[PDB]
Nucleic acid binder design. Structure first.
Lengths: 208, 198
DNA sequence: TATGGATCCATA
DNA sequence: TATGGATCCAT
């Protein structure tokens, strides 16, 4: 997979230039998102382009999550205190990791959005909320770009469609990454939808 | 239909206290939202409570829009300049109306959310964007409360689920209103569904 | 009566 | 075209 579009707030740029732990986080994220391939035996991600919305989204994230969790030690389902404890309503964050080096600690929250575009607004607000309540120091949202999404389940989150709203995270450190396949072709197999595209891996939950 | 819950940012409270144009927009929407009845012969909104999520959501909004549009003169699908003109990306706002009186104009935008709860965040954000850009002066969101939603299509916007995010509108004039059915009864007809997604 | 999602719809 | 929406799913 390749990263083709990115939006970095000014606040995230400042941390990205001076801060080594943030620098480290970003690198683990980029490398993880560039890792997905299709098919499994290939060295790049090629997507079937026979027709509009022909592919399901589930399997596309697998290799990204595996790398973060198993090679980089990020956790899944970290709940925010403002939600679990105070409001007692609202689910957790997709991915999370604490980066420590001597006295320094940096907490990063991230959501890899492949749901409907409307869900991304939710992920965005949810990260907004943990940033404003001091629970995370940087927020990251990963999603496909529009070109890629043309061949995915209809209406999934795409960079270009969320882009007019990026402006609502100003004043906070946030990074938006739009990924695209490295090739389009109808020789490759279709990513399955439904149960068949379902992940069957055990996930590294924060509660462990 | 009844209005059962409401959250008014302190900024909207001020306006609702001082502004007549604002009070008028408010009473209009309230009257309209209290509009829906079921069945069509009834004087109130009765909802078939046979099973969880047994009713569809479309025909619920009908009578509310009708009053807004036909009686009160609000306009549907009003595009925002930041999106249609500047960013050149994005859809319009659901209901809009200009309150003009003397040298005064009050611009109100409103979203009647019956889509997935996730959508509600899109609506909230789009209305925050119009507020931030000075295109509207008050933003309002109407949604079912959880009790009523329980009988509607699974996962539709419900007051209580959006509630933890109200604070994201802080500093802005906003109004969230949650409506409920006047009664529940298994003898009234089911609100039909469509064939969306799955 | 919990909650993030995954999928397809209809009208431009 | 592009966009808001509706409908069930999985844990």
């Amino acid at each position: 997979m390749e990263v083709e579009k990115e939006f970095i707030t000014d606040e995230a740029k400042e941390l990205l230039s001076k801060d080594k732990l943030i620098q480290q986080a970003y690198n683990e994220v980029k490398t993880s998102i560039c890792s997905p391939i299709w098919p499994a035996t290939s060295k790049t991600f090629t997507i079937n382009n026979t027709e509009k919305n022909c592919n399901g989204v589930v399997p596309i994230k697998e290799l990204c999550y595996t790398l973060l969790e198993d090679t980089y030690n990020w956790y899944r389902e970290k709940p925010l205190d403002i939600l679990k404890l105070e409001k007692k309503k609202g689910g957790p964050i997709d991915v999370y990791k604490e980066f420590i080096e001597n006295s320094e600690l940096k907490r990063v929250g991230m959501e890899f959005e492949t749901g409907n575009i409307s869900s991304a607004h939710r992920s965005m607000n949810k990260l907004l909320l943990g940033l404003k309540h001091g629970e995370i120091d940087l927020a990251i949202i990963l999603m496909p770009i529009k070109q890629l999404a043309y061949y995915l389940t209809d209406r999934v989150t795409n960079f270009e469609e969320l882009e007019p709203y990026f402006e609502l995270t100003e004043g906070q450190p946030f990074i938006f990454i739009g990924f695209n396949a490295e090739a389009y072709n109808s020789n490759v197999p279709l990513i399955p939808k439904g149960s068949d595209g379902m992940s069957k891996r055990s996930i590294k939950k924060w509660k462990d």
